[PDB]
C-alpha cells in the first residue's frame, strides 16, 4: 500500500510502453531477412557490400516514420510539448492516425500537414529533445527536404540516397523489392571462424564468395572448398542455405586459356570431367573455360548433394567477370530458400 | 645459426620442470579428501520466473549487485534490463549492432556494457537525467569480436575478445589502460577477483590464464582441457576457478596449487559447456550445456547434484545472484529462466 501501491503502478506503466515499442520491433525484425557475407581472400567481398522507383517510396517511408514519431512523442514526454500553433491541431491528429498503416500512398494532402508541422516551433522544440526518446537517425535531413520529395518528378540524388542508409561499418541493412535485408560482413574478424560463425544460425542465407581463379594461387580454391564443407557440416549451420558466388570469372578464363597452370594439377579428377549436358555457355566463351567453370561449380555442388537431407540448398553463381547486379540473384535465391523452407515443412518437397 | 632450436629446447625443458613441480604438489586429490564428506544428495531447483522480452536468441546476461535487476543481451539487437521479483522491464536499449556476444552489469548498477561481432564495447548510462538510456561511451580497440567483459568500477572496464587478447579500459578516457596478450586463440570468457586484484580467462587454446590488472602480465597458465574453454568462473574465496569447455567437461583449478583439482563430466554428455558459475558457498557448480539442460554439480564430490529442465534450445548464459538467493539462465530461445 502507501506509496508502494503507486510505484508498482509506475513500473507497470513503464513496462507497458516498453512492451509496446517491442511489439513494434518484432514486426520489423521478423519482416527482415538476415544474410551472412563471407569469403576467403582477394575476393573483394567488401565490394559487393560497397556498391530507382522504389528508393523514392523508401525515402518517403523514412520521412513519415520521422514526423509521426516526433508529433507522437510530444505529449508522451514528462513535460508534454505544446505546439506554438494550435491551428496545426487537426494536422497532428492526422499524423496520429496514418502511422503504422500498410502500403501508404502518401497523398498530396499528407505533405501539407507534415511540412506545416515541421514549421511549427513546438514540434521542432520536441525534436531538439529527440536525444531522450527514440527516433530514426535520418529525420531532419528528409524533414528539411519534404518540399523536394513532394514533386512528382522527384529523382533522389546520389548524395540524398547516402543518408537513407541504416549500423556497424560491416553491418548493412538494405531494401530490395520492398523486402528488408540485413547483411553482415565478417571481414572484421580473424580467420578462425568456429566461435563467431555460430553467431548466425538464424541467418536466412550465407553468401559465400570464392574466387574461381584461385585454383592455382597454394590452391586457395581447395581451401575455400574446405571452408564450405565445414560450414555445411556444422551442427549449428546444418539448417542454413549457402548462396555461392564464384568470383573472378575473367581471371579464371585468362588462367585457363594460358595453359601454364592446369586445374587437373590441383584437381586430377577434372581430366575425366566433361562439361554438363545442359551447359549454357555465354557468347565468346571458350568451351574450355565453360568446362572448368562448371567443374568448380560442381565441386561445390557435390558437397551440398552429399548430405541428401534437403534441409538446406546451395545456389551457385558466376560473377566479377563483369560487376553488374548480384543483388537480384541474392534476392531470388532467398525467395527460393524460404519457399523450400515452407515446402519441406509440409513434406511437399 | 640454430638459435630457434636452442630456444624450443629450453622451452620444452621449462615445460617439463613445471610439469614435475606440479606433479610434486599432487600428493592428494580433492576427490580423496572429500570422500568422507556428506554429499549434497539429489536436490533440484524449480523455475520461479520466466522472462520473455526477447525476439531472438539470448547470447548472455548478468545480475545486478542489488540481486534484483538483471541485464540480458540478444541477437535481436535489444538489451533488456529486468526486475527478477516483479518480472517487469526496467529498461530496453536498442543496440547499433544486432549481433551481441556479451554484456555486463556495473557494480553500482549505474552503467551497463555490451559487445559482440561489432568489436566494440558499448557503455550505456542508466542514470541519465535528460531521458532514456543512450550510448554513453563506446570503446573500440579490438581487432576481433567482444566475447566477454566486466566492470571493475564505474570508471575502468575489462573485456575479452576473439582478437586473442584481453584489455582493461578506462571509460572516461575512452582508451585502453592496459593490454593482456599471450592467448593462442579466441578468448571466450573471463572472471574477475572478489577484490579485482587479478582475473582469469578461458580461451580457444584450451587453456585458462590468470592475469594481474596492475602489472598487465599473465602470472599462471592452467591447462587441463582438451578443447576450447567456453566459460570461466571464480570460486567465492578467490583461490580457485571453474571452466566449461567443448570437451564437454567442467574443470576446477586451484591457483595456489597451480593445477586442476577435479573434473566434472558424464559418459552421457558429449556436448560442450556454454556457461558456468558457483553458489554462495561454492559447494555447487552450475554449468549450462548445448544439450539445452543445465547441470548442477558438487564442487567437492564431483557428482552432479541435480539438473535444470528448461529451454528448448541451447542455454547461452548462466548466473547466480550475489546473495546466492537465485539462479538465472538465458538460452537461444529468447527466454530467461530464474531458478530456486
Amino acid at each position: 500500500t502507501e506509496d508502494q501501491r503507486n510505484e508498482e503502478k509506475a513500473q507497470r506503466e513503464a513496462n507497458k510502453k516498453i512492451e509496446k515499442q517491442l511489439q513494434k520491433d518484432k514486426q520489423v525484425y521478423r519482416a527482415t531477412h538476415r544474410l551472412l557475407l563471407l569469403g576467403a581472400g582477394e575476393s573483394g567481398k567488401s565490394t559487393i557490400v560497397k556498391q530507382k522507383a522504389t528508393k523514392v517510396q523508401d525515402i518517403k517511408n523514412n520521412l513519415k516514420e520521422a514526423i509521426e514519431t516526433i508529433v507522437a512523442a510530444m505529449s508522451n514526454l514528462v513535460p508534454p510539448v505544446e505546439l506554438a500553433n494550435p491551428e496545426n491541431q487537426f494536422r497532428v491528429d492526422y499524423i496520429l492516425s496514418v502511422m503504422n498503416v500498410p502500403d501508404f500512398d502518401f497523398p498530396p494532402e499528407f505533405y501539407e500537414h507534415a511540412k506545416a508541422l515541421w514549421e511549427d516551433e513546438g514540434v521542432r522544440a520536441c525534436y531538439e529533445r529527440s536525444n531522450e526518446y527514440q527516433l530514426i537517425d535520418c529525420a531532419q535531413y528528409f524533414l528539411d527536404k519534404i518540399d523536394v520529395i513532394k514533386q512528382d518528378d522527384y529523382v533522389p540524388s546520389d548524395q540524398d540516397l547516402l543518408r537513407c542508409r541504416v549500423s556497424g561499418i560491416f553491418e548493412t541493412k538494405f531494401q530490395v523489392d520492398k523486402v528488408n535485408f540485413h547483411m553482415f560482413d565478417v571481414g572484421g574478424q580473424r580467420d578462425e571462424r568456429r566461435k563467431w560463425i555460430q553467431c548466425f544460425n538464424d541467418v536466412t542465407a550465407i553468401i559465400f564468395v570464392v574466387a574461381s581463379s584461385s585454383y592455382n594461387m597454394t590452391n586457395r580454391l581447395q581451401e575455400a572448398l574446405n571452408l564450405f564443407k565445414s560450414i555445411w557440416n556444422n551442427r549449428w549451420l546444418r539448417t542454413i542455405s549457402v548462396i555461392l558466388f564464384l568470383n573472378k570469372q575473367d581471371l579464371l578464363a585468362e588462367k585457363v586459356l594460358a595453359g601454364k597452370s592446369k586445374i587437373e594439377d590441383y584437381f586430377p579428377e577434372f581430366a575425366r570431367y566433361t562439361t554438363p549436358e545442359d551447359a549454357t555457355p555465354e557468347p565468346g566463351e571458350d568451351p574450355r573455360v565453360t568446362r572448368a567453370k562448371y567443374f568448380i561449380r560442381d565441386e561445390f555442388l557435390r558437397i551440398s548433394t552429399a548430405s541428401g537431407d534437403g534441409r538446406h540448398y546451395c545456389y551457385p553463381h558466376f560473377t566479377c567477370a563483369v560487376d553488374t547486379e548480384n543483388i537480384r540473384r541474392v534476392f531470388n535465391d532467398c525467395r527460393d530458400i524460404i519457399q523450400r523452407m515452407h515446402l519441406r515443412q509440409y513434406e511437399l518437397l | 645459426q640454430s638459435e630457434l632450436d636452442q630456444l624450443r629446447q629450453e622451452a620444452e625443458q621449462l615445460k617439463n620442470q613445471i610439469r614435475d613441480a606440479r606433479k610434486a604438489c599432487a600428493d592428494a586429490t580433492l576427490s580423496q579428501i572429500t570422500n568422507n564428506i556428506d554429499p549434497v544428495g539429489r536436490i533440484q531447483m524449480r523455475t520461479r520466473r520466466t522472462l520473455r522480452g526477447h525476439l531472438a536468441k539470448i547470447y548472455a546476461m548478468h545480475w545486478g549487485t542489488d540481486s534484483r535487476l538483471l541485464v540480458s543481451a540478444s541477437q535481436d539487437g535489444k538489451l533488456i534490463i529486468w526486475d527478477s521479483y516483479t518480472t517487469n522491464k526496467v529498461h530496453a536499449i536498442p543496440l547499433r549492432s544486432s549481433w551481441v556476444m556479451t554484456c555486463a552489469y556495473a557494480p553500482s548498477g549505474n552503467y551497463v556494457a555490451c559487445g559482440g561481432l561489432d568489436n566494440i564495447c558499448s557503455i550505456y548510462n542508466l542514470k541519465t537525467r535528460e531521458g532514456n538510456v543512450r550510448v554513453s561511451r563506446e570503446l573500440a580497440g579490438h581487432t576481433g569480436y567482444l566475447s566477454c567483459c566486466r566492470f571493475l568500477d564505474d570508471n575502468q572496464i575489462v573485456t575479452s575478445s576473439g582478437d586473442t587478447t584481453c584489455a582493461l579500459w578506462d571509460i572516461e578516457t575512452g582508451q585502453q589502460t592496459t593490454t593482456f596478450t599471450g592467448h593462442t586463440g579466441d578468448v571466450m570468457s573471463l572472471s574477475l577477483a572478489p577484490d579485482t586484484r587479478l582475473f582469469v580467462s578461458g580461451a580457444c587454446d584450451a587453456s585458462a590464464k590468470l592475469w594481474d590488472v596492475r602489472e598487465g602480465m599473465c602470472r599462471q597458465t592452467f591447462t587441463g582441457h582438451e578443447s576450447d574453454i567456453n566459460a570461466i568462473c571464480f570460486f567465492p574465496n578467490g583461490n580457485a576457478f571453474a571452466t566449461g569447455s567443448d570437451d564437454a567437461t567442467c574443470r576446477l583449478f586451484d591457483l595456489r596449487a597451480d593445477q586442476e583439482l577435479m573434473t566434472y563430466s558424464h559418459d552421457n554428455i558429449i556436448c560442450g559447456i556454454t556457461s558456468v558459475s558457483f553458489s554462495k558457498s561454492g559447494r555447487l557448480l552450475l554449468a549450462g550445456y548445448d544439450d539445452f539442460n543445465c547441470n548442477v554439480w558438487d564442487a567437492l564430490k564431483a557428482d552432479r547434484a541435480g539438473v535444470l529442465a528448461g529451454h528448448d534450445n541451447r542455454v547461452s548464459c548462466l548466473g547466480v545472484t550475489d546473495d546466492g538467493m537465485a539462479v538465472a539462465t538465458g538460452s537461444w530461445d529468447s527466454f530467461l529462466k530464474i531458478w530456486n
Partner: nanobody
Amino acid sequence: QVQLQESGGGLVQPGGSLRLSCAASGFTFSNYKMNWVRQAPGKGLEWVSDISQSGASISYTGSVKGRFTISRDNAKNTLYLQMNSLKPEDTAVYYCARCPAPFTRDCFDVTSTTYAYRGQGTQVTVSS
C-alpha cells in the same frame, strides 16, 4: 595439456618416399578428426589430408592424390602420413593438426599461425 609432436620427415631425393608420424596427447585421440597441414617456403598454410574419427571418411588434396596415404592408429594415439613419389613441389613443413571439437565433421583449423591444436611440425625437403 594438449600436444602433437610431428616426427620423421627429412631430406629425400625426388621420386622417393617419406613416412610422417605424429605423437598425440593431452586428449582422447579417438574423438577427433585428424589432418595434415603443410606450409611451403614463404607461403601460407595449406590443407593436405584429413581422416575422420572412425577412420572411414578420408580426404586428400588434389595434388597429393595417390601419392599420399593418411592412416591413423587410434589405440596408440598416433597419426600417420605415408608420402610416396615425393616431388620437389612437396617440400614444406608438415604439421599434424587435429580438429578443434570432439565428435564432429567440420574443422576450423589451418589458420595462419594462431592455431591452438597443431604440432610444431617437421621439415620435409625434396632435393633437386
